[PDB]
Amino acid sequence: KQMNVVLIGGGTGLSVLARGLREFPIDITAIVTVADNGGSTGKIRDVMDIPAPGDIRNVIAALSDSESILTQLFQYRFGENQVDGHSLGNLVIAGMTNITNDFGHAIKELSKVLNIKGQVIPSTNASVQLNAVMEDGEIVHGETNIPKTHKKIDRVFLEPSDVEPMNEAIEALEQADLIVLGPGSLYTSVISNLCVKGISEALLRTSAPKLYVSNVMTQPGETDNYDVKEHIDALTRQVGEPFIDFVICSSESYSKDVLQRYEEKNSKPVAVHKEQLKDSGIRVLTASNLVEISNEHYVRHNTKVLSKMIYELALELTSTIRFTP
Amino acid sequence: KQMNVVLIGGGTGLSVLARGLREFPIDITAIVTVADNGGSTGKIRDVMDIPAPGDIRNVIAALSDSESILTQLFQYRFGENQVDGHSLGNLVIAGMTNITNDFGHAIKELSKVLNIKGQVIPSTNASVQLNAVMEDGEIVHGETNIPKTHKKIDRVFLEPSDVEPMNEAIEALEQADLIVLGPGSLYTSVISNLCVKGISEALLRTSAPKLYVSNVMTQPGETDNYDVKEHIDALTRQVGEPFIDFVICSSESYSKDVLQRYEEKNSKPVAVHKEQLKDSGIRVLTASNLVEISNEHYVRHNTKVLSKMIYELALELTSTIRFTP
Numbered sequence: 001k002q003m004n005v006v007l008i009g010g011g012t013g014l015s016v017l018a019r020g021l022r023e024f025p026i027d028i029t030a031i032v033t034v035a036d037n038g039g040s041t042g043k044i045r046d047v048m049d050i051p052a053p054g055d056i057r058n059v060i061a062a063l064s065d066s067e068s069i070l071t072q073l074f075q076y077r078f079g080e081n082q083v084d085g086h087s088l089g090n091l092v093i094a095g096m097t098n099i100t101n102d103f104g105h106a107i108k109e110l111s112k113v114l115n116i117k118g119q120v121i122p123s124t125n126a127s128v129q130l131n132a133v134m135e136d137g138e139i140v141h142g143e144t145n146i147p148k149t150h151k152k153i154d155r156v157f158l159e160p161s162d163v164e165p166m167n168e169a170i171e172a173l174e175q176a177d178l179i180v181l182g183p184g185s186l187y188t189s190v191i192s193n194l195c196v197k198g199i200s201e202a203l204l205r206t207s208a209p210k211l212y213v214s215n216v217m218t219q220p221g222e223t224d225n226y227d228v229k230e231h232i233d234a235l236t237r238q239v240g241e242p243f244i245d246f247v248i249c250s251s252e253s254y255s256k257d258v259l260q261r262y263e264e265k266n267s268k269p270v271a272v273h274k275e276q277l278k279d280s281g282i283r284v285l286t287a288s289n290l291v292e293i294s295n296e297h298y299v300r301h302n303t304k305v306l307s308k309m310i311y312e313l314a315l316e317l318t319s320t321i322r323f324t325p
Numbered sequence: 326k327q328m329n330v331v332l333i334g335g336g337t338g339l340s341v342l343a344r345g346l347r348e349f350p351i352d353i354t355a356i357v358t359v360a361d362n363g364g365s366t367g368k369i370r371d372v373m374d375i376p377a378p379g380d381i382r383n384v385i386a387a388l389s390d391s392e393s394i395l396t397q398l399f400q401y402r403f404g405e406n407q408v409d410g411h412s413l414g415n416l417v418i419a420g421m422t423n424i425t426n427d428f429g430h431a432i433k434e435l436s437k438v439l440n441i442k443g444q445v446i447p448s449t450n451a452s453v454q455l456n457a458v459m460e461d462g463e464i465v466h467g468e469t470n471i472p473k474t475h476k477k478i479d480r481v482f483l484e485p486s487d488v489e490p491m492n493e494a495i496e497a498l499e500q501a502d503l504i505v506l507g508p509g510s511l512y513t514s515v516i517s518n519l520c521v522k523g524i525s526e527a528l529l530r531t532s533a534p535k536l537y538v539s540n541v542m543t544q545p546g547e548t549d550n551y552d553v554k555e556h557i558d559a560l561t562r563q564v565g566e567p568f569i570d571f572v573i574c575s576s577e578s579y580s581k582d583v584l585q586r587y588e589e590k591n592s593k594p595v596a597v598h599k600e601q602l603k604d605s606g607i608r609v610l611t612a613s614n615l616v617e618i619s620n621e622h623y624v625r626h627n628t629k630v631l632s633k634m635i636y637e638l639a640l641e642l643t644s645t646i647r648f649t650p
Binding site: 047048069070072073076078082083086088091092094095096098099109110112113 | 372373394395397398401403407408411413416417419420421423424434435437438
């Protein structure tokens with residue numbers, strides 16, 4: 001009965017969006033990058049050879065009952081003075097992986113124990129690192145160093161590169177009503193999944209339409225000076241052919257104070273250029289309240305609005321049409 | 326409807342027995358010592374000020390489904406090369422305790438999440454250490470050092486000594502059909518609970534009968550040369566008045582090879598002296614197969630037999646009697 005939406009990403013963009021979509025009658029599948037090597041995750045991957053648990057942990061938690069004892073434990077973190085400030089959920093994922101000898105199977109077992117509504121699937125079961133080639137040709141190693149340089153990223157890639165997707169991710173892409181990429185860091189959260197060759201191939205094979213959710217602001221070290229089309233072109237480069245049908249973005253202008261706050265952090269609004277996009281056959285979707293703005297001049301997506309737009313798009317794509325039989 | 330048996334102890338004696346009793350129609354309450362400071366537990370109590378999680382963890386696990394994912398995680402231990410060889414269950418108890426700011430409440434929440442049948446209750450909610458006074462008057466500090474000396478223990482005591490029992494332990498003692506002490510290390514596993522003054526007072530107040538399950542062999546550093554009556558007298562000393570009604574033990578003689586194996590480990594069978602016990606008003610209970618003996622000449626309790634004896638005693642104590650109205 002329910003519609004199937006597949007989210008591809010990583011980070012708080014994905015976990016916040018997944019929780020927002022939980023408010024609608026849709027079966028959510030999230031395909032989540034396992035390449036990070038910093039913070040919580042880096043602490044555990046130094047200890048043991050395991051794919052990154054952190055982004056996946058947050059997405060599992062987003063699809064579960066946040067008030068539950070088990071979700072509270074899963075999202076608990078020790079202070080730096082206890083157990084090296086580990087995430088207890090990451091430790092549980094690690095233990096589960098030692099038990100199953102299989103990260104993907106550990107994620108399946110834990111998802112069931114946490115009684116989530118949806119599914120969360122690693123982009124790959126393999127232990128990988130994300131690397132970048134800079135515009136000048138410099139190679140940067142590890143997800144943590146990629147934005148902490150100061151050059152244009154030309155491309156990102158995985159080491160080892162020969163890695164396979166999970167069967168369940170491919171099946172979800174094949175059978176989706178709608179596939180959503182982003183919002184999140186373009187290279188480290190979104191494209192990092194597309195670096196898994198079988199995921200990119202599935203995207204091109206499937207007739208499910210693909211939506212990109214644009215970032216509000218450019219991201220220092222990943223997307224400096226990118227307009228919306230440049231973000232899409234980076235996706236296209238990785239995948240091999242154009243494939244995005246829809247983009248959610250706002251072409252609103254921001255107050256002097258907002259622009260100032262983001263200039264100080266070396267960040268500007270992502271420019272839309274809606275005519276260029278329509279010429280490329282990409283449909284632009286917006287709403288007047290897509291973006292929320294704090295009293296301190298920070299901006300973010302309004303989760304309720306973004307979620308509803310996604311659900312309403314899936315609904316429209318699955319609706320009756322006009323033809324004569 | 327079901328009968329209520331309360332077990333007081335700590336260690337593998339208790340966890341094995343609790344699991345054995347799970348085979349019968351009885352509501353099990355286990356009151357478990359929280360004073361240990363060695364191994365798994367010591368690793369966590371060095372990190373954080375928390376009562377000992379380890380004995381309690383094992384008893385919770387004994388009352389749960391061992392094949393379950395959650396019980397498997399709870400009983401998982403990292404190798405020494407990962408997370409300092411911590412018990413994942415201990416880490417979860419620690420995190421839960423940080424969340425609730427209350428060890429007893431953390432144990433209640435975790436018991437429910439693990440879907441146990443029964444209840445497990447700490448002897449106290451306070452952080453304590455177990456100390457011993459030796460026969461010569463030497464004071465030894467911490468549960469780990471107590472057997473690792475080489476003198477008769479005169480008594481054990483808690484630091485701080487002013488600690489309170491949990492309300493649920495007291496209620497269970499008041500309403501029990503039968504209360505079982507042991508099997509386990511006499512001082513460090515059994516008497517350590519009785520050092521909580523309110524537990525000893527409840528034992529004397531209640532009309533529920535009390536059973537002591539004797540150790541098969543004397544324990545080096547705790548009960549060298551103790552016959553059964555000396556074990557009971559140590560309990561009596563702590564509590565203040567005689568209170569044991571029944572004792573389960575075997576007065577079988579062992580093969581030369583068994584005696585040899587235990588002599589090498591400075592250990593002999595605990596002598597019964599059944600006439601002395603009957604003169605003290607203590608009823609002795611045995612069975613021909615109470616003790617199992619390995620091909621390598623080790624001995625242990627037959628769990629099935631011991632469990633059934635306990636259940637059958639509760640049954641007899643709750644049965645109809647003869648009177649004229």
